């Protein structure tokens, strides 16, 4: 028995577990309950705090994963299954995990809080790529990762009603942040230096915590990796969320014909159906065929989000706030396999122009025919208008810039020009053990394994260059967690990471080579998405 | 007595003059009348052939310049005075010139036929830069230059009428080509090899002779130097041409206060007016403040133009035809000091962002406010959106591409893809004796000096490098006139000139350096003008 694996929080006593890294052990506490199980009558309702328990709750393994869709388009394939659930599915899933160094820090240490992505329909903090044992050992910080309700269980919204207000998944993350602010000190963590970081939908969640007033006091810094709250996929209107919720109820037999009708009878009927039944009809409520679009997503109700994310970003004071932000080299290449015509992960995807003209409608859904002609213009090399190799990566840029790159660059510039300290990066390293085809380059979400120091795992087949490269990135992220500056506090030998300003627009390239400063997060392409096309949609 | 300076044509006998070049003499016949003077009741009417005369007509000096506006914006400035008339103005101006080598060729020699430009409102074959003594002596070819009516006297059109049909200025050029087919052999020229070549509005006129059936039988090859018939300035609609004709009549006092205003009474009142009075109200007819727009231009009417130039270029067959087209490096830079705000030839024209936003409305007149923002989007550096030096060259590209570069690139692509053998060039040499400011680079029309061998004149301060450079260009144009191929027939040593096709789109940079093959005649920019902007103006 180690005296450090026994820790008492405000709810009760816990028993952690020691993990083994090549450089030392780490005390981990996996599966702490931070909310009452949202089952039965609590489905679609905001979370309630965990009632205090008697005894010692076992915290030596990851708890259950929230109910979600499971990708089966490529069985056995590691590229898709690495994000699939690794524990059993249950609505009793609201748990968090805390990693702390050994020996436990005597002084308060900055805290990192990870929010997994997964398009607000999937994800779990128990994934092997989110194993934070390598970060808290190499940088001696504290890491906390929580589970939140995805799918309809976390984002089915009947706005205005009480039985289904929506954004209950975002409230799950907020309750975990309140838990960290009240209990991370018992693990040696500094609640006055909490840094949020997330990827994809988790990055969009970090951005919505910047814009929600009740959540701002629960952290101090933010990191958004390949995601932003102002994306075309990260929010839906009240009128659309009500239509998607009513269609899901109809697909499962709610209301029973013929009874109706109001929101009270509709949600009460939804609570009687099994959880997996609701999941089996999640994708059948999307309005049209598309990629990078998800069914149940954070809504602009008016409570958690007083206005649309775009408006709050433009009318907010961001002084005294440090933000890290970046994207990968090929954001859209991952999503083309899931809908774009003529795309297969097992060939070269040398598409024809007819397939390219059709793919723009899938990549850019719900838009006028004239607006499609404008997208075809900007992303077509007119010296070689039918080269399959160029058309392939052109549509990859379309989906990447429309959903991730330009919504992120829009957010990064407005933050710096309004008082926030902003740093920008572009991840340009493809892992040697990547199972996706070559033409995808660096897919969506394949920098997470380097942030958490996965190449340090001796059971993996990474190169010696990638191990040193992962330690640089871990120190980049940890330095931002401590001082809000990724540059070394004193070390001048390493190249400098200049802040991203609204005018200069400077970012760095994260790869095996040293830092390289560049200007423009696809400024020419993103001016089409952020400036002209909105004016093209008002005059239909 | 040199018996080579007295030649008999179908009209009568002529008397030429010997002019000396550093390489030898050349016989010239300047001022041959090819039509009865269009005065009095002949104003605005098509030309009629010159009746035969008695005795010897003196052809020693250039005749009179057609009535036209004279530029007085910069008095004494050679950059503008070089295009102003050098002979006195008169309505009796329909005269042509022929240059023939000495000794006169005993074998029929291919003929080059020059059509001067100047926005269909000015110009004269008597300009010093149109001297064909060097082009004829160095390559032993027959040069023929003509005068055609400009301004209202050549292009005022009341469509459907009989006294103001329009395109009578283009009919003057046709009559001169008929004169060449009947009399160029008397000077030693081959009427079965005539090659039209013009610049600006003259280059457009060369294109309109390609699209006119009654004129296609009068030549075999074509050269369009920075000008195309499908440009937004080369033609005008029926209804607008009538409004511009009625606008001019009102400003001069037609009809008198109290009388009717049909087409017959309007022109009869116009014929009773002094020629200079009509010229003094030409620019007060344009519908708005603009540049690269002219009052009286050729009119699509169903006679000389059975349809619009763009329609005839698309539905035309051009087998058995070889064309040579091209542009200068800085087309629109010259027109910016004629209306664009913040421009001045005496400073560096470092304009502001607001001046650039207003210049697009002047450079691109009569477009929806939404259409201009698409132009602003495509022609601004979004990383340096406020740099005056970049905004200056940007607006130069806007006027250059919209009026010249893109209308020409579309024509060359349609000609090659439908039978014609097209050759494309880009002139990139700034003359060492140029008087315009340096930021204009290579302005509109400053390659004519080198084609006509002007640097060979000993009374000028051209460098020795430009003298060899001019001889290269005179041979390119002469080889095209002889065989239809600008490359040397007996030479694989010198760099070759690949034809321009609709697929590869290869062109050549003409400079002191050897030939350099490039691809794409501003493809990315011209795809916005030729393809997208029509689709946007349709949905307005
Ligand atoms: O990868 C991440 C997060 N990484 O952290 N984002 C989700 C990527 N999605 C890509 C496209 C949508 N969708 C495909 C699966 N379902 C279907 O579209 C049709 N199924 O039948 C989900 C996967």
Question: What is the helix content of chain A?
Answer: 25-40%
CATH topology of chain A: Rossmann fold
Count of beta strands of chain A: 14
Element string of chain A (H = helix, E = strand):
EEEEEHEEHEHHEHHEHHHHEHHHEHHEEH
Question: What percent of residues of chain A are in strands?
Answer: 15-25%
- Give the neighbour order of strands across the main sheet of chain A: 3-4-6-8-7-9-10-11-12-13-14
CATH level 4 superfamily of chain A: Alpha/Beta hydrolase fold, catalytic domain
Biggest interface in this structure? A-B, 21 and 18 residues
PDB class: hydrolase
Keywords: reactivator complex, bis-oxime, hydrolase
Assembly: dimeric
Entry title: Binary complex of native hAChE with oxime reactivator LG-703
Description:
The structure is a homodimer of 540-residue chains. Chain A is of the alpha/beta class and 540 residues long. Chain A has one domain: Alpha/Beta hydrolase fold, catalytic domain (Rossmann fold). The first copy, chain A, has an 11-stranded mixed β-sheet with strand order 3-4-6-8-7-9-10-11-12-13-14, sandwiched between helices. Chain A has a 3-stranded mixed β-sheet with strand order 1-2-5, with no helix packed on it. In chain A, strand 3 and strand 4 form a beta hairpin. In chain A, helix 11 runs parallel beside helix 13. Chain A starts with 5 loop residues before the first strand and ends with a helix. Chains A and B meet through helix 12 and helix 16 of A and helix 12 and helix 16 of B. The complex binds the ligand O=C(/C=N/O)NCCN1CCCN(CCNC(=O)/C=N/O)CC1. Chains A, B: Belongs to the type-B carboxylesterase/lipase family. Chains A, B: It is found in: Synapse; Secreted; Cell membrane. Chains A, B: This is Acetylcholinesterase. Chains A, B: Its main location: other. Chains A, B: It catalyses: acetylcholine + H2O = choline + acetate + H(+).
């Amino acid at each position: 028995e180690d005296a450090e694996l026994l820790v008492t929080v405000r709810g009760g006593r816990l028993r952690g577990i020691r993990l083994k890294t090549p450089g030392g052990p780490v005390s981990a506490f996996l599966g702490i309950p931070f909310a009452e199980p949202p089952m039965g009558p609590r489905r679609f309702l905001p979370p309630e705090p965990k009632q205090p328990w008697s005894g010692v709750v076992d915290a030596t393994t990851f708890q259950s994963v929230c109910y979600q869709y499971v990708d089966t388009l490529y069985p056995g394939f590691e590229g898709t299954e690495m994000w699939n659930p690794n524990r059993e599915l249950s609505e009793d899933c609201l748990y968090l995990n805390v990693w702390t160094p050994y020996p436990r820090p005597t002084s308060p240490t900055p805290v990192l809080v990870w929010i997994y992505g997964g398009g607000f329909y999937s994800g779990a903090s128990s994934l092997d790529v989110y194993d934070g044992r390598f970060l808290v050992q190499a940088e001696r910080t504290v890491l906390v990762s929580m589970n939140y309700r995805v799918g309809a269980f976390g984002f089915l919204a009947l706005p205005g009603s009480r039985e289904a207000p929506g954004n209950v998944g975002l409230l799950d993350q907020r309750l975990a942040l309140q838990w960290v602010q009240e209990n991370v000190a018992a693990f040696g963590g500094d609640p006055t230096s909490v840094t949020l970081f997330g990827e994809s939908a988790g990055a969009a969640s970090v951005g919505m915590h910047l814009l929600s007033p009740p959540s701002r006091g629960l952290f101090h810094r933010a990191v958004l990796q390949s995601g932003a709250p102002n994306g075309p996929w990260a929010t839906v209107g009240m009128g659309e969320a009500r239509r998607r919720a009513t269609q899901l109820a109809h697909l499962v037999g709610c209301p029973p014909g013929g009874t109706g009708g109001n929101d009270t009878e509709l949600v009460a009927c939804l609570r009687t159906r099994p959880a997996q039944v609701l999941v089996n009809h999640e994708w059948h409520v999307l309005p049209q065929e598309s990629v990078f679009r998800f069914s149940f997503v954070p809504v602009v109700d008016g409570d958690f989000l007083s206005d649309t994310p775009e408006a709050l970003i433009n009318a907010g004071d961001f002084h005294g706030l440090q933000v890290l932000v970046g994207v990968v080299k090929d954001e859209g290449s991952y999503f083309l396999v899931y809908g774009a015509p003529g795309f297969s992960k097992d060939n070269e995807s040398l598409i024809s122009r007819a397939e390219f003209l059709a793919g723009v409608r899938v990549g850019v859904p719900q838009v006028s025919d004239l607006a499609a002609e404008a997208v075809v213009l900007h992303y077509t090399d007119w010296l070689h208008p039918e080269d399959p190799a160029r058309l392939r990566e052109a549509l990859s840029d379309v989906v990447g810039d429309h959903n991730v790159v330009c919504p992120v660059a829009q957010l990064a510039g407005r933050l710096a020009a309004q008082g926030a300290r902003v740093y920008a990066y572009v991840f340009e390293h493809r892992a040697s053990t990547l199972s996706w085809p070559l033409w995808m380059g660096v897919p969506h979400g394949y920098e997470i394994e380097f942030i958490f120091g996965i190449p340090l795992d001796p059971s993996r087949n990474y190169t010696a260059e990638e191990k040193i490269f992962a330690q640089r990135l871990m120190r980049y992220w940890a330095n931002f967690a401590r001082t809000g500056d990724p540059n070394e506090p004193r070390d001048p030998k390493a190249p400098q990471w200049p802040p991203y300003t609204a005018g200069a627009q400077q970012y760095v390239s994260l790869d095996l080579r040293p830092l390289e400063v560049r200007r423009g997060l696809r400024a020419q392409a993103c001016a089409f998405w952020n400036r002209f096309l909105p004016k093209l949609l008002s005059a239909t």
